[PDB]
């Protein structure tokens, strides 16, 4: 089965591929933000939103991945390939989970309309060659 | 962040651990069931249910963990520690995801109330001595 985590919310992996990989914040910073702004709703016994459901599940999956990798690293005796393991983990799953956390936190804070328009406009900005694109990139904001 | 994947639904890790671990079907069987019965609803661009959202996210997390484990198994060479990591996975994460998929599929099929009362009933049953319980294990059915 082929599931897209954003098709349910109005987006797709192509739309969120307008943003580069180095655009997305660290998973630690995104989790800090999630806590700060929606801790009491994510720890709540309510279907507060599909975004909350998804964010809970994603936080748990990330925890499970980290648990596995930690048990691994601590149970192994070779600390040399422990560099390539984190390289792969980050490069592959950290990007997915950063994309995901970002999308959910941003669509909770700013809205679906705003986040879709942001994706489109940032695709414009980044498709544009550097000799003709402003320095003030699109920024997602309430002010 | 102390999130319970079921609190949003009306259950708990304690309640789903009220059933024995050798009761939950395999991840393969449960994914086959999910496909057969709800593929077109999970691949849909709609919030059909919080159970649908959670099932999507859980299927994807299982995929990520499987990719990681396969890559790790390619890396590591010794069948001993390879079977060891498989054991750890299927013991902790395997069980978590079996419980999760079972809960969501079963609720989608039968009802949250039905599934929770079934948890309770089957736990009381498996804990009651045989001479003073109904001889046949509770089964969850549609007919």
């Amino acid at each position: 089965m082929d599931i897209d985590p954003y098709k349910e919310f109005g987006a797709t992996v192509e739309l969120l591929s307008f943003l580069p990989s180095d655009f997305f914040p660290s998973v630690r910073d995104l989790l800090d933000t999630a806590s700060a702004l929606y801790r009491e709703a994510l720890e709540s016994p309510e279907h507060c939103s599909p975004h909350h459901t998804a964010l809970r599940q994603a936080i748990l999956c990330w925890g499970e991945l980290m648990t596995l990798a930690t048990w691994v690293g601590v149970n192994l005796e070779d600390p040399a390939s422990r560099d390539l393991v984190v390289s792969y983990v980050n490069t592959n799953m950290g990007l997915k989970f950063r994309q995901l956390l970002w999308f959910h936190i941003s669509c909770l804070t700013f809205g679906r309309e705003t986040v879709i328009e942001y994706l489109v406009s940032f695709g414009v900005w980044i498709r544009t060659p550097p000799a003709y694109r402003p320095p003030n990139a699109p920024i997602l904001s309430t002010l | 962040m102390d999130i319970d994947p079921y609190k949003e639904f009306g259950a708990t890790v304690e309640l789903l651990s009220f059933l024995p671990s050798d009761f939950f079907p395999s991840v393969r069987d449960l994914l086959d069931t999910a496909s057969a019965l709800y593929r077109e609803a999970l691949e849909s661009p709609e919030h059909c249910s919080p159970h649908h959202t959670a099932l999507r996210q859980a299927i994807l997390c299982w995929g990520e963990l499987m990719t990681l484990a396969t890559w790790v198994g390619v890396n590591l060479e010794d069948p001993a520690s390879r079977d060891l990591v498989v054991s750890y996975v299927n013991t902790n994460m395997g069980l978590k995801f079996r419980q999760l998929l079972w809960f969501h599929i079963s609720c989608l099929t039968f009802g949250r109330e039905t599934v929770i009362e079934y948890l309770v009933s089957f736990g009381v049953w498996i804990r009651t001595p045989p001479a003073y319980r109904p001889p046949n294990a509770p089964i969850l059915s549609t007919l």
Partner: peptide
Amino acid sequence: SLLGR
């Protein structure tokens, strides 16, 4: 508890 690659 042993590794390669």
